[PDB]
Scaffold this active site. Structure first.
Site, PDB file in Angstrom:
ATOM      1  CG  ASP A   1       0.005  -4.078   2.938  1.00  0.00           C
ATOM      2  OD1 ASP A   1       0.636  -3.403   1.870  1.00  0.00           O
ATOM      3  OD2 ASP A   1      -0.126  -3.320   3.679  1.00  0.00           O
TER       4      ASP A   1
ATOM      5  CG  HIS B   1      -0.176   0.343   2.617  1.00  0.00           C
ATOM      6  ND1 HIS B   1      -0.102  -0.700   3.423  1.00  0.00           N
ATOM      7  CD2 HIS B   1      -0.270   1.255   3.024  1.00  0.00           C
ATOM      8  CE1 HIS B   1       0.244  -0.366   4.465  1.00  0.00           C
ATOM      9  NE2 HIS B   1       0.328   1.093   4.112  1.00  0.00           N
TER      10      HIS B   1
ATOM     11  CB  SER C   1       3.100   0.424  14.110  1.00  0.00           C
ATOM     12  OG  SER C   1       1.977  -0.506  13.844  1.00  0.00           O
TER      13      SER C   1
ATOM     14  CB  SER D   1       2.853   1.973   6.244  1.00  0.00           C
ATOM     15  OG  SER D   1       1.511   1.505   6.554  1.00  0.00           O
ATOM     16  N   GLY D   2       5.390  -0.292   6.408  1.00  0.00           N
ATOM     17  CA  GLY D   2       6.206  -0.977   5.341  1.00  0.00           C
ATOM     18  C   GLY D   2       7.574  -1.016   6.018  1.00  0.00           C
TER      19      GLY D   2
ATOM     20  CD  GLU E   1      21.938  11.800   6.169  1.00  0.00           C
ATOM     21  OE1 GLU E   1      23.083  12.299   5.694  1.00  0.00           O
ATOM     22  OE2 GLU E   1      21.532  12.663   7.119  1.00  0.00           O
TER      23      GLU E   1
ATOM     24  CB  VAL F   1      19.441  17.234  10.523  1.00  0.00           C
ATOM     25  CG1 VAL F   1      20.541  17.868  10.461  1.00  0.00           C
ATOM     26  CG2 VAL F   1      18.447  18.079  11.506  1.00  0.00           C
TER      27      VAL F   1
ATOM     28  CD  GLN G   1      -2.314   5.985  10.810  1.00  0.00           C
ATOM     29  OE1 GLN G   1      -3.072   5.048  10.413  1.00  0.00           O
ATOM     30  NE2 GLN G   1      -2.446   6.448  11.811  1.00  0.00           N
ATOM     31  N   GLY G   2       2.624   6.638   9.222  1.00  0.00           N
ATOM     32  CA  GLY G   2       4.208   6.799   8.943  1.00  0.00           C
ATOM     33  C   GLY G   2       5.008   5.703   8.948  1.00  0.00           C
TER      34      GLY G   2
END
Ligand SMILES: [Ca+2]
Lengths: 14, 223
Positions: free
Chosen positions: B84, B40, B172, B177-178, B62, B57, B174-175
């Site tokens: 999913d 999703h 967990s 997911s995955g 990264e 930041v 929203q944000g």
């Protein structure tokens, strides 16, 4: 209600 | 993550952020070229951000790499959220280091009562909204099928499990997911859905990764 945990949330059937 | 704690910089080195001008989902690095996430979370123009702690930041270690392919499970269903799971191929291989490392896939499924680590940059509030700078962590047990099916009548398939606390307050959100659910050093779950976040008798629902190991391997080999 039923929501995916993405931003933004998507509905699920529930 | 609601009711969690600050993981500590790079203590979850397989955790990635999916970015499209903002953080929208998590993922887990499984080799230098492939990320597991939720179907999703699919969209065009995904940038994978690896080696992150504070996503707001730039420190310089990264790695920001575009997705060249985002492959949802062929039997994904956006209504039921069955299957999913999604594989993202990176346009270039990530450079593995202390902050960027893959998480092992399971060889067997996990069981009720097993404690797992769930992580993400998702909402930290069950009512209203607050998004953290740094990665958040939550220890949570896999719940019985009975608990899960009572919470979600008619909605739980063999490809899902519930994890969390029936009293509420820890979940967990929203944000997230995955992102990963890791149990005894194996990726057993993917943050998927729930009825809100951290609500009484509404634990988080997670994609059951152990069911997809052959599909993952075949998809990596074919792409
Ligand atoms: Ca950063």
């Amino acid at each position: 209600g039923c929501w995916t945990k993405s931003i933004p949330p998507k509905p699920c059937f529930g | 993550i609601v009711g969690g704690y600050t993981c500590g910089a790079n203590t979850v080195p397989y955790q990635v952020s999916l970015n499209s001008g903002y953080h929208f989902c998590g993922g887990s690095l499984i080799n230098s070229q492939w990320v597991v996430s939720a179907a999703h979370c699919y969209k065009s123009g995904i940038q994978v951000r690896l080696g992150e702690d504070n996503i707001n930041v730039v420190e310089g270690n990264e790695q920001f790499i575009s997705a060249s392919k985002s492959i949802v499970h062929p039997s994904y269903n956006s209504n039921t959220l069955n299957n999913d799971i999604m594989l993202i191929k990176l346009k270039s291989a990530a450079s593995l280091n202390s902050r960027v490392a893959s998480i092992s896939l399971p060889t067997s499924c996990a069981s009720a009562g097993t404690q797992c680590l769930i992580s993400g940059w998702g909402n930290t509030k069950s009512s209203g909204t607050s998004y953290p700078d740094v990665l958040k962590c939550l220890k949570a047990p896999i719940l019985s099928d009975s608990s899960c099916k009572s919470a979600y009548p008619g909605q739980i398939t063999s490809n899902m499990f519930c994890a969390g606390y029936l009293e509420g307050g820890k979940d967990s959100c929203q944000g997230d997911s995955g992102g990963p659910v890791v149990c005894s050093g194996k990726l057993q779950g993917i943050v998927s859905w729930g009825s809100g976040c951290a609500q009484k008798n509404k634990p988080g629902v997670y994609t059951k990764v152990c069911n997809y190991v052959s599909w993952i391997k075949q998809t990596i080999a074919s792409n």
